[PDB]
């Protein structure tokens, strides 16, 4: 039971509700009308992962104290334009961190 709302360049998402330290939060991008694409992911304690295209330009940051997180577009370009989604995956069914958007069960509203 968590509700994710993202605003926003530096996007930032706040997730109301209890977030256990073993949950893994990810940012996805949806291209204009084909399918969602992976952008980034990280647990609530460390060990972040990034996409092949997005490597070193976008930095993942989490507050860990106010249940908020942010993404920095330090090298944004018109090439990577999409609708950004923030998702939670609980380790309630499996601890296997996956790159599949189907595995994530809590989603925020799309931005931009």
């Amino acid at each position: 039971q968590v509700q994710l709302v993202e605003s926003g360049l530096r996007l930032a998402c706040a997730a109301s509700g209890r977030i256990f330290s073993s949950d893994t939060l990810a940012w996805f991008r949806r291209a204009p009308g084909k399918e969602r694409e992976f952008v980034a992911a990280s647990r609530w304690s460390g060990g972040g992962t990034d996409y092949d295209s997005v490597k070193g330009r976008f930095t993942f940051s989490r507050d860990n104290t106010f249940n908020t997180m942010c993404l920095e577009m330090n090298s944004l370009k018109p090439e990577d334009t999409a609708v950004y989604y923030c998702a939670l995956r609980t380790a309630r069914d499996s601890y296997y961190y996956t790159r599949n958007p189907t595995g994530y069960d809590y989603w925020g509203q799309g931005t931009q």
């Binding site: 256990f20 330290s21 073993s22 647990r43 304690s45 460390g46 060990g47 380790a91 601890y95």
Partner: peptide
């Protein structure tokens, strides 16, 4: 479930 260890089966 709150443990911070990153390798649990």
């Amino acid at each position: 479930r709150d443990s911070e260890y990153g390798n649990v089966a």
